[PDB]
Amino acid sequence: PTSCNPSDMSHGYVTVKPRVRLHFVELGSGPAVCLCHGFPESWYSWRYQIPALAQAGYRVLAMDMKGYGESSAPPEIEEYCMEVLCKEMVTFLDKLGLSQAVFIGHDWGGMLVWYMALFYPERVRAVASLNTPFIPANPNMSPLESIKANPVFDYQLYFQEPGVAEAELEQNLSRTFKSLFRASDESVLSMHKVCEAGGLFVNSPEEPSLSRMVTEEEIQFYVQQFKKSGFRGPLNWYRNMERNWKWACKSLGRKILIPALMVTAEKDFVLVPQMSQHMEDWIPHLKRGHIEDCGHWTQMDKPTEVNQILIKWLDSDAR
Amino acid sequence: PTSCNPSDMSHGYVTVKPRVRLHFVELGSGPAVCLCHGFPESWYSWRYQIPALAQAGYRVLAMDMKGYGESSAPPEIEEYCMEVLCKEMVTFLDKLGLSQAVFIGHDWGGMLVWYMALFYPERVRAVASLNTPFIPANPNMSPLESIKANPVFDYQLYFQEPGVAEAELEQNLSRTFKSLFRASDESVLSMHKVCEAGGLFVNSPEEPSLSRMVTEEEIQFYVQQFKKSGFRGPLNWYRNMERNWKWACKSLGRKILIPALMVTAEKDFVLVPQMSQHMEDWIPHLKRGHIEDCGHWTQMDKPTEVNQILIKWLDSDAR
Ligand SMILES: CC(C)(C)N1CCO[C@H](COc2ccc(NC(=O)NC3CCCCC3)cc2)C1
Ligand SMILES: CC(C)(C)N1CCO[C@H](COc2ccc(NC(=O)NC3CCCCC3)cc2)C1
Numbered sequence: 026p027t028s029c030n031p032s033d034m035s036h037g038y039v040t041v042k043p044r045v046r047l048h049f050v051e052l053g054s055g056p057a058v059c060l061c062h063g064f065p066e067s068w069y070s071w072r073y074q075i076p077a078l079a080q081a082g083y084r085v086l087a088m089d090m091k092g093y094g095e096s097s098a099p100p101e102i103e104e105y106c107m108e109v110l111c112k113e114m115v116t117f118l119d120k121l122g123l124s125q126a127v128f129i130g131h132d133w134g135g136m137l138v139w140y141m142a143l144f145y146p147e148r149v150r151a152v153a154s155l156n157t158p159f160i161p162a163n164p165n166m167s168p169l170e171s172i173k174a175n176p177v178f179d180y181q182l183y184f185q186e187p188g189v190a191e192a193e194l195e196q197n198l199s200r201t202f203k204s205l206f207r208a209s210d211e212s213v214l215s216m217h218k219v220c221e222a223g224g225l226f227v228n229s230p231e232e233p234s235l236s237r238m239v240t241e242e243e244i245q246f247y248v249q250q251f252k253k254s255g256f257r258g259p260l261n262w263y264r265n266m267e268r269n270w271k272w273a274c275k276s277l278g279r280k281i282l283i284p285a286l287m288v289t290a291e292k293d294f295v296l297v298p299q300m301s302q303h304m305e306d307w308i309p310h311l312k313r314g315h316i317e318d319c320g321h322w323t324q325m326d327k328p329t330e331v332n333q334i335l336i337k338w339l340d341s342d343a344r
Numbered sequence: 345p346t347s348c349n350p351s352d353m354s355h356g357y358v359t360v361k362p363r364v365r366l367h368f369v370e371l372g373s374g375p376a377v378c379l380c381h382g383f384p385e386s387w388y389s390w391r392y393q394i395p396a397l398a399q400a401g402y403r404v405l406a407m408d409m410k411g412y413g414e415s416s417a418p419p420e421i422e423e424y425c426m427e428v429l430c431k432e433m434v435t436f437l438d439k440l441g442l443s444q445a446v447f448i449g450h451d452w453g454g455m456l457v458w459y460m461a462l463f464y465p466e467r468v469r470a471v472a473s474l475n476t477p478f479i480p481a482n483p484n485m486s487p488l489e490s491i492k493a494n495p496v497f498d499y500q501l502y503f504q505e506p507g508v509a510e511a512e513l514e515q516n517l518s519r520t521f522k523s524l525f526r527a528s529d530e531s532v533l534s535m536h537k538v539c540e541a542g543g544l545f546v547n548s549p550e551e552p553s554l555s556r557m558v559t560e561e562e563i564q565f566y567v568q569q570f571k572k573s574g575f576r577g578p579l580n581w582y583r584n585m586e587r588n589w590k591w592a593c594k595s596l597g598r599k600i601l602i603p604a605l606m607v608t609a610e611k612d613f614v615l616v617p618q619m620s621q622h623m624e625d626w627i628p629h630l631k632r633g634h635i636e637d638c639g640h641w642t643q644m645d646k647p648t649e650v651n652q653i654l655i656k657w658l659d660s661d662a663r
């Protein structure tokens with residue numbers, strides 16, 4: 026599938042708060058489709074989708090989320106709570122003069138677009154998430170224990186204390202992204218042993234091989250992007266669990282009434298498909314997609330399957 | 345009519361040549377409408393149109409033309425010939441992934457969009473010009489004498505030699521724009537006596553009053569923009585008459601077959617309406633608008649009339 030060369034895109038910049046501007050890349054004409062990447066990624070994680078969606082008749086806006094790339098990265102941890110991130114994305118639409126947009130997200134971006142669907146349905150034409158389920162907030166369970174209930178989320182505790190994960194992730198950025206951006210059968214890390222081993226990579230190769238999913242050039246683009254602001258901003262998306270919990274609780278009782286799509290990846294061992302199994306009860310018009318042989322990095326593991334799923338859904342439920 | 349605050353726009357940047365990027369502001373959703381300002385102006389000359397068109401259902405892209413504002417201003421005079429300017433605007437569309445756009449232009453921007461219609465009709469959904477007629481190139485008359493045939497174009501000779509006009513226009517930028525941006529009944533200069541008086545302003549007030557059309561704040565925005573790159577780039581649009589002549593001649597014999605709109609201003613004493621009187625013969629589907637009591641600065645003299653004319657035409661002949 027056709028990918029993207031970064032210097033041949035149109036780059037757009039929108040100021041949403043005094044010291045916060047969002048960067049995005051824009052390709053195509055038609056209904057506005059806003060792509061929202063996950064951790065720790067980039068607008069460029071959508072490189073295989075951007076030209077495909079544009080060619081299918083859509084105006085694509087691929088975000089550098091707050092903390093990433095060319096977008097502003099405010100220093101405060103609480104600027105990356107889900108509530109401020111959504112309200113900024115509404116201002117984004119406001120300043121662009123868009124009444125609504127289709128929202129498609131992956132990982133933390135997928136969490137974001139569900140909350141945009143839940144609290145700002147008037148502004149979301151339709152919503153799709155890759156891997157990330159929508160699970161109503163449990164007003165009786167704190168976020169801390171719901172992590173301790175599943176050892177797979179052990180790495181999110183390691184991510185909590187500022188500066189600890191930043192040092193590991195920034196010590197060798199090429200090692201970082203070659204160790205992360207891998208297919209499930211190629212993985213070189215266990216999210217289980219992280220807080221017991223003292224880090225994500227301490228048992229991983231120092232000179233990791235290059236995944237079949239990516240080139241050295243594509244790795245070096247991510248590396249370039251993260252020299253700009255580092256990992257604090259991105260990691261901060263994990264450091265608002267209790268804030269995000271309380272805000273999510275303020276919604277309870279309402280369904281998402283807009284067209285929706287949940288895409289599951291069969292070998293995402295963290296965002297496993299079954300975590301999504303009763304979303305229909307909260308999202309009446311939910312349609313599904315599922316990708317076999319697909320790990321966590323959905324857009325680059327299986328670009329063609331993603332493109333097909335998205336375009337079929339956009340043409341039937343977004344126009 | 346609703347105007348624009350510059351810090352609350354979405355700003356877009358597209359690289360079209362190695363050292364040339366075009367800046368534009370983008371508001372709204374719908375068919376792409378590209379606004380192209382004249383001399384010596386800015387995307388901000390369209391401030392009264394941008395929100396009105398967006399509200400009517402159009403995606404507005406208001407350009408900072410090459411040499412202006414936040415767009416690149418290459419040093420070479422021949423980079424501002426009409427041929428390079430159009431081909432760059434095609435690349436603009438290419439890099440944005442737009443198959444076509446409606447093009448609307450004023451003064452030199454209006455000249456540009458006619459040539460985009462003439463040589464790139466496949467890329468122009470529809471075309472409109474304010475004040476600037478389309479007059480087929482006369483392959484038997486050089487541009488120099490066709491100026492000497494009408495003393496009104498005397499100032500274009502004064503504009504020819506690099507550095508001469510730049511010094512006058514840059515010596516007091518507030519004086520420059522308050523002396524230029526005026527209604528016809530308020531004008532303080534004669535384009536007739538310029539090469540005989542030795543300049544545009546030498547007989548004009550040193551502290552000119554402020555036109556009823558503009559505020560001090562709006563003057564200061566233009567002033568800010570022109571501190572960036574000065575007047576050489578903009579003036580260079582006038583310094584390619586023979587190049588533009590030869591290229592225009594290479595078209596002769598073809599009509600503009602796409603939907604078109606010519607808007608005349610009754611008190612534009614340079615781009616007078618009669619200069620447009622036989623465009624129908626070269627442009628079969630041409631529709632007209634005409635604004636009484638309107639000087640050269642069409643968008644800010646008579647914003648409401650402009651908006652009405654444009655939106656009615658866009659809705660009937662552009663969709
Ligand atoms: C119960 C649930 C689901 C709500 N939990 C527990 C409590 O809080 C978190 C908050 O929600 C999210 C949402 C997305 C992610 N994505 C992620 O971690 N991607 C990793 C990138 C690096 C390699 C491994 C994968 C993480 C957390 C989730
Ligand atoms: C015959 C014709 C029409 C082709 N001529 C003669 C030969 O070449 C020029 C080239 O075409 C253009 C096109 C637009 C402009 N606009 C302009 O001058 N605006 C001024 C701003 C400052 C105050 C006064 C008005 C000028 C020249 C025109």
Ligand SMILES: [Mg+2]
Nearest residue numbers: 302303305306
């Ligand atoms: Mg159920």
Ligand SMILES: [Mg+2]
Nearest residue numbers: 621622624625
């Ligand atoms: Mg005739």
